[PDB]
Enzyme design. Structure first.
Site, PDB file in Angstrom:
ATOM      1  N   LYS A 153       0.182   3.622  -2.874  1.00  0.00           N
ATOM      2  CA  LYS A 153      -0.536   4.556  -2.657  1.00  0.00           C
ATOM      3  C   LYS A 153       0.119   6.813  -2.467  1.00  0.00           C
ATOM      4  O   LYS A 153      -0.868   7.348  -2.378  1.00  0.00           O
ATOM      5  CB  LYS A 153      -1.325   4.998  -1.804  1.00  0.00           C
ATOM      6  CG  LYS A 153      -2.855   3.397  -1.695  1.00  0.00           C
ATOM      7  CD  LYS A 153      -3.776   2.579  -0.447  1.00  0.00           C
ATOM      8  CE  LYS A 153      -4.781   2.017  -1.122  1.00  0.00           C
ATOM      9  NZ  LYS A 153      -4.299   0.652  -1.199  1.00  0.00           N
ATOM     10  N   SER A 184      -7.030   2.477   3.179  1.00  0.00           N
ATOM     11  CA  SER A 184      -6.246   2.176   2.214  1.00  0.00           C
ATOM     12  C   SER A 184      -7.027   1.633   1.256  1.00  0.00           C
ATOM     13  O   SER A 184      -6.948   0.298   0.760  1.00  0.00           O
ATOM     14  CB  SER A 184      -5.019   0.931   2.665  1.00  0.00           C
ATOM     15  OG  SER A 184      -4.128   0.722   2.181  1.00  0.00           O
ATOM     16  N   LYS A 197       1.755   6.122   6.798  1.00  0.00           N
ATOM     17  CA  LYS A 197       0.933   4.949   5.419  1.00  0.00           C
ATOM     18  C   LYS A 197       1.956   3.937   5.776  1.00  0.00           C
ATOM     19  O   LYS A 197       2.614   3.526   6.011  1.00  0.00           O
ATOM     20  CB  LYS A 197       0.739   5.844   4.284  1.00  0.00           C
ATOM     21  CG  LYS A 197       0.105   4.382   3.083  1.00  0.00           C
ATOM     22  CD  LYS A 197      -1.477   4.654   3.092  1.00  0.00           C
ATOM     23  CE  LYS A 197      -2.456   3.821   2.819  1.00  0.00           C
ATOM     24  NZ  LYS A 197      -2.408   2.310   2.901  1.00  0.00           N
ATOM     25  N   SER A 203       0.738  -1.363  -0.237  1.00  0.00           N
ATOM     26  CA  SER A 203      -0.218   0.440  -0.091  1.00  0.00           C
ATOM     27  C   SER A 203       1.032   1.310  -0.554  1.00  0.00           C
ATOM     28  O   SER A 203       0.305   2.204   0.106  1.00  0.00           O
ATOM     29  CB  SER A 203      -1.550   0.156   0.655  1.00  0.00           C
ATOM     30  OG  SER A 203      -1.919  -0.914   0.987  1.00  0.00           O
TER      31      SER A 203
END
Ligand SMILES: *[B]([O])([O])[C][N]C(=O)C1=[C][C]=[C][C]=C1Cl
Ligand SMILES: [Mg+2]
Ligand SMILES: [Mg+2]
Length: 466
Positions: A52, A298, A410, A49
């Protein structure tokens, strides 16, 4: 203090949980540019992720913090005295936050405009993006699950988290020996049902499984649910999100006194349409607010949809090859050096994605001084915050440590991949860091990740709240 830290971080990267992992670890004092820590910074790794980060940054660069998304309903011509139209079109332009409610409001507009009978057919039009539902290298066995929901320009998002292209399945025990009840939710009358599930004796083993066998639009429910068990809810995806959107709209319409006489199916607004009569529209919240559920939780679906929206903006092409070049482009334009970056999707679900930690941090830098820095940093999970919309995927990590309420980062996770990357804002100066690990064989190395983040909070000048 500087050297003490390096020795500390070395020691944290000695954990037997990182046996045979490769780990990219990079800290940089953002005010000065001083590189506080580099290990394997140039090493290419699967980001999960953390991808992102790039996706979210490009979309702000390309669409702006102020971009919103639209959905229209169109008939060939307005309704008359009789309040009649032939065929009808639900047109989606990639709103990732489009709810069943939003559909209802549109049904009401369609009614308040004087439609009383759709004499012809109802078409779901998701042609603003292409119909390539999945990335090549995404895994078939993942397809029943939310994060691997099909991609469309017309997709109904479920709940406050705006999970696109799913339906909530609720399985409820009956009496011992009877079939469990299975409630398909939104997909009632859309997805097929295969209920083989049973209600086991009180306190027997919970063994119920909910799946969408590959290549089907059928929800297969197997196993046994205890008679005393609390009902099980699951988010399972469906085949053709736009068709589901089509389906729920015929329902919305009939519930607003508008009779659909024909059939629901896919179809784009025809070319021989002279001057389309738009009978209802809806507009999403601005990209700045969509960012929150997107990054906090997410949302893979969101990242992909945003990719195709970049392809639309830069090339008038709601497409993966298009949008992904758009991302490298926008990232370069930002001043990022994208050499070590290989882009295969927007979400990071693909094992084709590669990034380095030098790159991640590089990005953290530019992002931090972009005109859109605040709305970008607001989107990140905040260490240890109990509010789901704030703590996000960090909610239950790093509580009561110096990191709590300060570290913005993140996460990223799959088989053999973990990552944490973000900022440590200091009464010293604002730090940027990337930690990305691949190939570990045990449980995701979250302790290591946390320990480092916590150290950087302390070096930044922080203490655990008591
Ligand atoms: B990020 O790390 O959440 C991207 N990865 C995923 O979402 C994911 C990958 C593989 C299996 C499940 C999930 Cl949620
Ligand atoms: Mg239904
Ligand atoms: Mg603190």
């Amino acid at each position: 203090r500087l050297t003490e830290l390096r020795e500390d971080i070395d020691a944290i990267l000695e954990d037997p949980a990182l046996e045979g992992a490769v780990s990219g670890v990079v800290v940089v004092d953002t005010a000065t540019g001083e590189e506080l820590y580099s290990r394997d910074g140039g090493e290419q790794l699967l980001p999960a992720s953390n991808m992102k980060l790039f996706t979210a940054a490009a979309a702000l660069e390309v669409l702006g913090a102020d971009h919103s998304f639209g959905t229209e309903v169109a008939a060939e011509s307005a309704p008359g005295r009789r309040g009649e139209v032939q065929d009808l079109y639900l047109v989606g332009r990639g709103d990732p936050t489009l709810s069943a409610e939003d559909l209802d409001a549109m049904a009401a507009e369609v009614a308040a405009s004087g439609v009383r009978t759709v004499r012809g057919d109802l078409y779901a039009d998701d042609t603003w993006f292409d119909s390539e539902r999945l990335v090549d290298d995404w895994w078939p066995e993942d397809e029943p699950y939310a994060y691997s929901a099909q991609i469309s320009a017309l997709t109904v998002a479920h709940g406050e988290r705006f999970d696109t292209g799913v339906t909530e399945v609720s399985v409820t025990p009956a009496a011992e020996g009877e079939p469990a009840d299975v409630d398909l939710g939104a997909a009632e009358g859309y997805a097929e049902l295969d209920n083989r599930a049973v209600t086991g004796a009180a306190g027997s083993a919970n063994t119920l499984v909910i799946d969408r066998p590959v290549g089907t639009n059928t929800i297969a429910v197997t196993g046994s649910l205890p008679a005393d068990a609390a009902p099980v809810t699951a988010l399972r995806t469906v085949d053709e999100p736009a068709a589901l959107a089509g389906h729920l709209f015929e329902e919305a319409l009939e519930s607003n006194g508008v009779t659909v006489k024909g059939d629901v199916g896919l179809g784009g607004v025809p070319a021989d349409w002279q001057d389309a009569e738009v009978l209802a529209d809806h507009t999403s919240a601005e990209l700045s607010e969509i960012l929150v559920p997107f990054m906090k939780f997410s949302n893979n679906g969101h990242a992909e949809m945003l990719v195709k929206s970049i392809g639309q903006e830069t090339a008038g092409a709601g497409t993966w090859d298009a949008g992904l070049v758009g991302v490298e482009e926008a990232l370069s334009g930002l001043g990022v050096d994208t050499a070590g970056l290989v882009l295969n999707d927007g979400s990071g679900l693909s094992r084709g994605n590669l990034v380095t930690a030098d790159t991640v941090v590089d990005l953290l830098g530019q992002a931090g001084s972009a005109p859109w820095a605040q709305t970008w940093s607001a989107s990140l999970p905040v260490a240890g915050e109990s509010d789901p919309f704030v703590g996000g995927t960090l909610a239950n990590r790093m509580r009561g440590t110096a990191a709590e309420g300060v570290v913005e980062a993140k996460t990223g996770t799959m088989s053999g991949v973990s990552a944490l990357s973000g900022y440590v804002p200091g009464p010293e100066g604002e730090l940027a860091f990337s930690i990305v690990n691949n190939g570990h064989s045990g449980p995701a190395p979250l302790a290591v990740q946390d320990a480092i983040a916590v150290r950087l909070a302390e070096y930044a000048g922080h203490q655990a709240p008591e």
